[PDB]
Amino acid sequence: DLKGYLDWITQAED
Amino acid sequence: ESARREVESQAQQQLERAKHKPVAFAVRTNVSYCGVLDEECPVQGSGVNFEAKDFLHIKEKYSNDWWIGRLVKEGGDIAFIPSPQRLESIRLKQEQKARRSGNPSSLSDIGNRRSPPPSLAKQKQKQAEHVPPYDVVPSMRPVVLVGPSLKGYEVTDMMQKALFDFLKHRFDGRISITRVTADLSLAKRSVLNNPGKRTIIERSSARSSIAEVQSEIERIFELAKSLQLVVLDADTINHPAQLAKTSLAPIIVFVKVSSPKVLQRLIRSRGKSQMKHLTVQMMAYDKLVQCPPESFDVILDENQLEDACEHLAEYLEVYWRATH
């Protein structure tokens, strides 16, 4: 889950 | 009788003339009724089989007892929906077929207490609440993203910003994205006849922000009539029930996490800034996940970027085609 959850949390703003 | 056939033909002939005309307005029905069983419909057999919490689109005007409307469902045909007064007439019809409707019980008491119908036995009484059967809701339901934590912070703003850009790119040239700063959860209709009519009264509610609340609501109404899809980026929404009783009732889109363990490590990857407010972010997810899922319009349980995006894409596309 953290694989697809940490990738969504980064590219959105940064 | 030829008059009934003539009025059937004249009303029917007008039906296809308005088939390709812009939608006038829209309301919401919170009661279950069928427009085909009624014998007072101008056209018999072309009624609407609607249920509680449905949507309709009025386009023209016919009379004070009937209206022309189109169902929000895909493939919606021409149908007749009873007027607010007409629904009241059939509302009294539903509970008048019983043995008694007022105070005088028929418990083996006939011939002694006639009990002529008083004022309390009619619809003019019971004015404590007087919930209107038809509520003026926007023609198109606005789409709002909620969760998984407090709005206006780093966590919630960016995980919703991506979906705004993803929807904007695919719906470019046909969608409008607007962010509202004023509070929207206070969209009430039956508080007073005109709370804070003027800004120079210098009353309790004249100098407050309540006046700014209503001004945005009519803009939402006018933006709804534009026929273009509109989503709201309101930061004043945290619970679906807070913005459920209001007339707008936006589309509540829920983003959920499989376990709090994922959430706890998420802020850990952010930094030292969000750990201080991490205590209230954990509460926000908990107080939102305990709400029953059926209240929320849709759910987003997928974790990937793509499967989370296109899942809502067809839901909005099927709604877009269903309206027209």
Author numbering:
A (entry chain A): 434 to 447
B (entry chain C): 38 to 361
Tell me, in the authors' exact words, what the paper reports.
Voltage-gated calcium (Cav) channels regulate a broad range of physiological processes, such as muscle contraction, synaptic signal transduction, and hormone secretion. Cav1.3 channels belong to the L-type (L for long-lasting current) Cav subfamily (LTCC) and display diverse tissue distributions in brain, ear, heart, and endocrine organs. Here, we present the high-resolution structures of human Cav1.3 complex, comprising the pore-forming α1 and auxiliary α2δ-1 and β3 subunits. Similar to rabbit Cav1.1, the conformation of human Cav1.3 is consistent with an inactivated state, as all voltage-sensing domains (VSDs) are depolarized and the intracellular gate of the PD is closed.
Cinnarizine is accommodated in the central cavity of PD. Cinnarizine is coordinated through extensive contacts between its core DPP group and residues from repeats II and III. Besides, piperazine of the core group is H-bonded to Asn740 on S6II. The cinnamyl group, which points to the SF vestibule, is sandwiched by Met363 and Phe1100, whose carbonyl oxygen groups are constituents of the inner Ca2+-binding site in the SF. Compared to the apo state, the S6 segments in the four repeats undergo structural shifts upon cinnarizine binding. To accommodate cinnarizine, the helical turn of S6III containing Phe1141 undergoes both a π → α secondary structural transition and an outward motion to avoid steric clash. Interestingly, the helical turn where the gating residue Ile1152 is positioned undergoes an α → π transition, which appears to tighten the intracellular gate.
